Design an enzyme around this catalytic site. Structure first.
Site, PDB file in Angstrom:
ATOM      1  N   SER D 248      48.571 -10.538 -14.860  1.00  0.00           N
ATOM      2  CA  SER D 248      47.512  -9.695 -15.373  1.00  0.00           C
ATOM      3  C   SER D 248      47.811  -8.269 -14.921  1.00  0.00           C
ATOM      4  O   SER D 248      48.514  -8.068 -13.925  1.00  0.00           O
ATOM      5  CB  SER D 248      46.178 -10.170 -14.813  1.00  0.00           C
ATOM      6  OG  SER D 248      46.104  -9.913 -13.421  1.00  0.00           O
ATOM      7  N   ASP D 256      33.201 -11.190 -18.761  1.00  0.00           N
ATOM      8  CA  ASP D 256      32.416 -11.021 -19.991  1.00  0.00           C
ATOM      9  C   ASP D 256      33.152 -11.541 -21.194  1.00  0.00           C
ATOM     10  O   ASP D 256      32.537 -12.134 -22.086  1.00  0.00           O
ATOM     11  CB  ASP D 256      32.057  -9.560 -20.198  1.00  0.00           C
ATOM     12  CG  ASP D 256      31.103  -9.063 -19.148  1.00  0.00           C
ATOM     13  OD1 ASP D 256      31.169  -7.867 -18.814  1.00  0.00           O
ATOM     14  OD2 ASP D 256      30.311  -9.884 -18.636  1.00  0.00           O
ATOM     15  N   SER D 284      41.630 -14.157 -19.915  1.00  0.00           N
ATOM     16  CA  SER D 284      42.978 -13.753 -19.551  1.00  0.00           C
ATOM     17  C   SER D 284      43.564 -12.725 -20.518  1.00  0.00           C
ATOM     18  O   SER D 284      44.329 -11.854 -20.094  1.00  0.00           O
ATOM     19  CB  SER D 284      43.895 -14.965 -19.386  1.00  0.00           C
ATOM     20  OG  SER D 284      43.442 -15.763 -18.302  1.00  0.00           O
ATOM     21  N   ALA D 286      41.865 -10.362 -21.743  1.00  0.00           N
ATOM     22  CA  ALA D 286      41.284  -9.140 -21.172  1.00  0.00           C
ATOM     23  C   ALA D 286      42.127  -8.544 -20.054  1.00  0.00           C
ATOM     24  O   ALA D 286      42.192  -7.341 -19.916  1.00  0.00           O
ATOM     25  CB  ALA D 286      39.852  -9.386 -20.686  1.00  0.00           C
TER      26      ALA D 286
HETATM   27  N1  LIG Z   1      44.198 -12.210 -12.334  1.00  0.00           N
HETATM   28  C1  LIG Z   1      44.065 -12.938 -13.469  1.00  0.00           C
HETATM   29  N2  LIG Z   1      45.095 -13.454 -14.166  1.00  0.00           N
HETATM   30  C2  LIG Z   1      44.936 -14.174 -15.292  1.00  0.00           C
HETATM   31  N3  LIG Z   1      43.739 -14.431 -15.841  1.00  0.00           N
HETATM   32  C3  LIG Z   1      42.636 -13.935 -15.252  1.00  0.00           C
HETATM   33  C4  LIG Z   1      42.736 -13.155 -14.020  1.00  0.00           C
HETATM   34  N4  LIG Z   1      41.511 -12.807 -13.656  1.00  0.00           N
HETATM   35  C5  LIG Z   1      40.679 -13.314 -14.572  1.00  0.00           C
HETATM   36  N5  LIG Z   1      41.342 -13.987 -15.515  1.00  0.00           N
HETATM   37  C6  LIG Z   1      40.749 -14.678 -16.664  1.00  0.00           C
HETATM   38  O1  LIG Z   1      39.402 -14.236 -16.791  1.00  0.00           O
HETATM   39  C7  LIG Z   1      38.498 -15.334 -16.621  1.00  0.00           C
HETATM   40  C8  LIG Z   1      37.200 -14.790 -16.030  1.00  0.00           C
HETATM   41  O2  LIG Z   1      37.619 -14.041 -14.878  1.00  0.00           O
HETATM   42  P1  LIG Z   1      37.059 -14.324 -13.419  1.00  0.00           P
HETATM   43  O3  LIG Z   1      37.183 -15.756 -13.038  1.00  0.00           O
HETATM   44  O4  LIG Z   1      37.636 -13.315 -12.481  1.00  0.00           O
HETATM   45  O5  LIG Z   1      35.486 -14.066 -13.736  1.00  0.00           O
HETATM   46  P2  LIG Z   1      34.529 -12.934 -13.146  1.00  0.00           P
HETATM   47  O6  LIG Z   1      34.789 -12.683 -11.703  1.00  0.00           O
HETATM   48  O7  LIG Z   1      33.085 -13.270 -13.513  1.00  0.00           O
HETATM   49  O8  LIG Z   1      34.962 -11.669 -14.016  1.00  0.00           O
HETATM   50  P3  LIG Z   1      34.287 -10.222 -13.881  1.00  0.00           P
HETATM   51  O9  LIG Z   1      34.762  -9.687 -12.569  1.00  0.00           O
HETATM   52  O10 LIG Z   1      34.826  -9.534 -15.114  1.00  0.00           O
HETATM   53  O11 LIG Z   1      32.805 -10.439 -13.889  1.00  0.00           O
HETATM   54  C9  LIG Z   1      39.290 -16.287 -15.734  1.00  0.00           C
HETATM   55  O12 LIG Z   1      38.818 -17.629 -15.703  1.00  0.00           O
HETATM   56  C10 LIG Z   1      40.673 -16.161 -16.332  1.00  0.00           C
HETATM   57  O13 LIG Z   1      40.803 -16.833 -17.582  1.00  0.00           O
END
Ligand SMILES: Nc1ncnc2c1ncn2[C@@H]1O[C@H](COP(=O)(O)OP(=O)(O)OP(=O)(O)O)[C@@H](O)[C@H]1O
Ligand SMILES: Nc1ncnc2c1ncn2[C@@H]1O[C@H](COP(=O)(O)OP(=O)(O)OP(=O)(O)O)[C@@H](O)[C@H]1O
Ligand SMILES: Nc1ncnc2c1ncn2[C@@H]1O[C@H](COP(=O)(O)OP(=O)(O)OP(=O)(O)O)[C@@H](O)[C@H]1O
Ligand SMILES: Nc1ncnc2c1ncn2[C@@H]1O[C@H](COP(=O)(O)OP(=O)(O)OP(=O)(O)O)[C@@H](O)[C@H]1O
Ligand SMILES: Nc1ncnc2c1ncn2[C@@H]1O[C@H](COP(=O)(O)OP(=O)(O)OP(=O)(O)O)[C@@H](O)[C@H]1O
Ligand SMILES: Nc1ncnc2c1ncn2[C@@H]1O[C@H](COP(=O)(O)OP(=O)(O)OP(=O)(O)O)[C@@H](O)[C@H]1O
Ligand SMILES: Nc1ncnc2c1ncn2[C@@H]1O[C@H](COP(=O)(O)OP(=O)(O)OP(=O)(O)O)[C@@H](O)[C@H]1O
Ligand SMILES: Nc1ncnc2c1ncn2[C@@H]1O[C@H](COP(=O)(O)OP(=O)(O)OP(=O)(O)O)[C@@H](O)[C@H]1O
Ligand SMILES: [Mg+2]
Ligand SMILES: [Mg+2]
Ligand SMILES: [Mg+2]
Ligand SMILES: [Mg+2]
Ligand SMILES: [Mg+2]
Ligand SMILES: [Mg+2]
Ligand SMILES: [Mg+2]
Ligand SMILES: [Mg+2]
Lengths: 304, 308, 304, 308
Positions: D248, D256, D284, D286
């Site tokens: 990423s 979101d 992902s 995103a």
């Molecule tokens: N570092 C990463 N590499 C690859 N995919 C990612 C990464 N971070 C997030 N994602 C994708 O984004 C999805 C949602 O991200 P995450 O689990 O960080 O949720 P979140 O913490 O609620 O996000 P946010 O901080 O935007 O509120 C993950 O399940 C994954 O599919």
């Protein structure tokens, strides 16, 4: 005593916020911001208030952020003369990081000013009485041509308004272009950019300051030197005032506090010495804006 | 011009390295280090060599790192009087971050000293002739009781060795406890620790410095004030010299450079003002460049001339 | 069970130190360092020790730092076979910043190796019995030509020494040049550099790993994917093992712990699945090097 | 395909700015900001629009900042149902540091809401037809009691509005207290706070998620695991989807984007696996770019295809 006005073409409603840590990428959860009046001329007016004087802050104000900025200055009993601007008063961000004790200052441009609003501000400026002092302090907002700054200052001085300039980059040259500026306070890097050379030799600052005075561009140049105080230059005098061997703990508001103090001293027809000593006292007081008591204490030491 | 010596009980062989970015967690790939001589007395001697003087750096050296330290001083024509130490000369890390132009300095303790090794070092010191100047500069390394440093300075003074001190914390307090120190150069924090109070009022630094000289701890106190220059204090004079309005690019070697310069001025029997002005000139000369070049003769001369 | 050796051409005696804050310019006062054994192959040997196995760490050791490195491994009961090197064992710096809880890792090259000392190391390597496993892990120190790495690996495999490579950049290509490498564990960016293209598409990692296997360069490629685990590729199989939804709190030692675990599994003629699962378990255990208990717990979950 | 709505009680108009370096004390000169729509529900709606769906973003908007927020959503063809708020739509700051390529995000609370303004927002919500989906996403702004959010969700569910929740802290706990939430997407920290214990053991996340569904708080719990993808949990299934081995570049809009994608899959009556896979694909997607572009249709499609 003569009336003091300031002009902030790029004011702001600044958000002061706290966060435990600073690191990239993550959401840094920041506390509900405390709003602070931002902008050179505005803060000069505030510093002047702190110092027992009065200065009317002239500035564009737009939207609810502009209203809040006006309201904050109202509550600090800073007289204000605003021009309503289409574009909302912009917000800079001051982040205090708890873990490190560090403050971060994210400084974006002021709201845009269209040509009409600038003339409106010019109008306000031209309503200032002859002999009164105008401090033009801060960045140049988007939408304002450099020549218009020059034009405002010409127009102002053509009416006996005594102009004090604190700016940077192209705006500082533009403000200084018609010459006969009462007082200019570049810091070192502003002086360097203004005179368009690196100031690397011991005498470079003095020589650049004396050049500006000599070319008739400014009657007085006070080069502020951060912890090193300031070098004030007249057609008659050249002095360095260095603050007492104290602190410092912050630099925020140092320049504007100094400019406010020097403006009061200018208004009082003080000597170059008194002006710079008081400027250094207020700027340095700010580093502990400036409080009256702290400024007086530094000033007494400088005058001892 | 009397003979000048420096004593560094905690020297180091510093690694200067470059890395594109700085951030936690990840491996920061750092370039093959450039080795630099570390330690207060060592750099005081180096600064003196830069200024066209000669000071013999006395210090423990241990292992290949010690050897390289000595070799670095050789290359710089800095005379040396080493005692071989069992514990290898330690390494501090200076990291230049390319992206930001920033430098990080990671300062760890010097190597340990035996009682024997310290005895040898004291010996080296006590071979200094009466009237010669010794600059004791830097941290106190592990293995050395504070009393040993105090005893060393007492013994040195006993035989007319003129002692200049640049240290911090307990070592500084210990070094001054003896008293009759010719010159001490605390910076503001060190003065504050030494005098055991905050310096918040305009005249606090001056009074604190005057307190130290009035107590007999030191004949001359030069409180260095970073960009604000220095306040030198005598039994007769208080003079502040502020450097010229040139923005510094670095602070590495400022304090040692100043001490080297003032040591020279002291050795030349300069006035307090001359000494402080030359100290400020050299200290500020050092700030003109990143790295560990310290003050150059030319930059110091230029600044001193201006301050004069 | 077969004997395991590792080779660290660029070992280090690392200093772990603590400082309250990290900021530039100032002297950061750091605590007396705790010395740590540094270097890929060395840490693979240590991880193997932690996992109930035994691996002999082959490496150049110079001076008192080399001696200390040897002594630290002696105290961890890691068997060692050293070559005395002219240049003293270099020191990397691990700084823990108290205020932020962050760790900073300053990783400089290993001490230089001259041509004689490398042949001495080659000599040591060639003394390894046929069928034994050699893990060549870490950077290439100054003084070693890439072709010599290739030569060592050729020579090793020409004697039935089963070679496991964990390296980066030109050294990883060089180590893999003669082909028939038992196991290679690039991480993503190492795989990217090796195959010489950005891995931007979902299948790029798999395809690059399968390419390496297919070209006969390595019998097994395990692309480690940090928190995403690892993708193991055989001539028969392709699997991704992802660690349990836990932590992580550090990444230090993740790769070497994984390589040590996979090496043990290789030695035990485990399946690709078992090898990678155990690798991911150990690498991930390290992120909480790997402890036996933590590894077993992750491994049991992965195998459930 | 039913109608989809999102609710953002704390929206923002974010300033994205660039500055060459980051360091304390000094004025960091930042470029004229690019304004970005902020707030969970708003970006869920945006992510849905990106994925070729349509969701109406319900939110308070106040002042010219509110107006610009609405205007930004207009430009993106994101349908909107706003209530004018007295307190101006607040601004978060996104700072890109050129030298390092790093982005800083400064998240402050949303603007205050009156009781009247919240009443209007609830009203807007209660105009949603039975069977339609509401995504309540983001922080709870000042001026709103937790009970009001719970009351809102109860009222919504009362009239057959299918509620999806993405929040943290007390707001999340409050939102789930009602129960019968169709889908909640805590990330690991949020799950931990919600279930009120550390998740340190391999099966902790799963069990915590199963605990939430077994209690009736939520029918579906998708614990998002950052780079580890997500673990989706039903009364019948526990499935973990890990994103493909693409590194990423950013995490902005990941959560979101995932929620938008899963909302669509929920609306389409996809299996849990399909929903989580599409969530992971979008989330992902995103991460592939810096900024606030969220997931693109193409990147999400590519990743989803791979995950399938
Ligand atoms: N570092 C990463 N590499 C690859 N995919 C990612 C990464 N971070 C997030 N994602 C994708 O984004 C999805 C949602 O991200 P995450 O689990 O960080 O949720 P979140 O913490 O609620 O996000 P946010 O901080 O935007 O509120 C993950 O399940 C994954 O599919
Ligand atoms: N999805 C992710 N991918 C990679 N790194 C992450 C992810 N989420 C968090 N991190 C790392 O952990 C640090 C702290 O992040 P944190 O746990 O606060 O997540 P966040 O996305 O900022 O907030 P939230 O918990 O609201 O989603 C981040 O600066 C980042 O380096
Ligand atoms: N670090 C410091 N220590 C003591 N006094 C200071 C320091 N920095 C500034 N001052 C005081 O403030 C005055 C003005 O500050 P400085 O020269 O930094 O101007 P400036 O750069 O225009 O300030 P600003 O960044 O607020 O616009 C100085 O001349 C001095 O009296
Ligand atoms: N396994 C990991 N888990 C979480 N974050 C990681 C991991 N590897 C790297 N990162 C993140 O990426 C940044 C740079 O790490 P990098 O990609 O250089 O990996 P590394 O482990 O430091 O080096 P190497 O490529 O030699 O393994 C770090 O700031 C770190 O936060
Ligand atoms: N920022 C600066 N600008 C100009 N001159 C400086 C600056 N910092 C130091 N100097 C010069 O160096 C002299 C010694 O520096 P300083 O007062 O910082 O001593 P110090 O803290 O003991 O130095 P060090 O950190 O090297 O031990 C100062 O008195 C001054 O002449
Ligand atoms: N001479 C100086 N000139 C400019 N900034 C300084 C100077 N000394 C310290 N600072 C600032 O204050 C920060 C903390 O410095 P500190 O007071 O620890 O001085 P130091 O030189 O690191 O240590 P010492 O007290 O041993 O001289 C530094 O990172 C630097 O930004
Ligand atoms: N952030 C993390 N969370 C959970 N497990 C991790 C993380 N980082 C690494 N691991 C475990 O460690 C294994 C190896 O780590 P990674 O893929 O980062 O290799 P690497 O970059 O070679 O490590 P190193 O930087 O130590 O050389 C992974 O496959 C995984 O099992
Ligand atoms: N008056 C001062 N006193 C101490 N440090 C300063 C001062 N001014 C600048 N610095 C240092 O230099 C760095 C950059 O500051 P810079 O030269 O841009 O001045 P500034 O006050 O931020 O901006 P300006 O030039 O607009 O006044 C900061 O990290 C700060 O530590
Ligand atoms: Mg200024
Ligand atoms: Mg400034
Ligand atoms: Mg010092
Ligand atoms: Mg210092
Ligand atoms: Mg690795
Ligand atoms: Mg790694
Ligand atoms: Mg989220
Ligand atoms: Mg997150």
């Amino acid at each position: 005593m003569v009336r003091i006005y300031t002009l902030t073409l790029a004011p702001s409603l600044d958000s002061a916020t706290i966060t435990p840590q600073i690191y990239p990428e993550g959401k840094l959860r920041c506390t509900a911001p405390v709003f602070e009046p931002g902008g050179g001329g505005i803060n000069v007016a505030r510093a002047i208030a702190h110092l027992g004087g009065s200065a009317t802050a002239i500035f564009p104000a737009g939207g609810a952020t502009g209203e809040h900025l006006v309201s904050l200055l109202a509550d600090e009993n800073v007289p204000v003369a605003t021009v309503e601007a289409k574009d909302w008063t912009r917000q800079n961000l001051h982040v205090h990081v708890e873990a490190s004790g560090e403050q971060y200052r994210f400084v974006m441009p002021g709201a845009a000013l269209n040509e009409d609003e600038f003339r409106q501000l010019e109008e306000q400026v031209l309503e200032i009485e002859s002999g009164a002092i105008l401090v033009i302090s801060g960045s140049l907002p988007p939408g304002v041509k450099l020549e218009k700054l020059t034009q405002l200052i010409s127009a102002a001085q053509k009416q006996g308004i005594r102009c004090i300039v604190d700016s940077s980059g192209e705006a500082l040259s533009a403000a200084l272009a018609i010459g006969n500026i009462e007082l200019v306070k570049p810091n070192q890097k502003e002086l360097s950019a203004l005179v368009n050379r690196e100031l690397t030799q011991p005498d470079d600052v003095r020589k650049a300051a004396q050049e500006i005075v000599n070319s008739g561009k400014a009657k007085r140049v006070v080069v502020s030197l951060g912890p090193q105080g300031a070098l004030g230059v007249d057609s008659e005098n050249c002095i360095q005032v260095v603050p007492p061997p104290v602190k410092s703990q912050s630099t925020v508001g140092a320049g504007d506090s100094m400019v406010g103090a020097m403006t009061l001293k200018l208004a009082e027809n003080a000597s170059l010495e008194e002006m710079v000593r008081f400027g250094v006292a207020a700027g340095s007081a700010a580093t502990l804006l400036c409080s009256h008591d702290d400024t007086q204490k530094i000033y007494a030491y400088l005058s001892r």
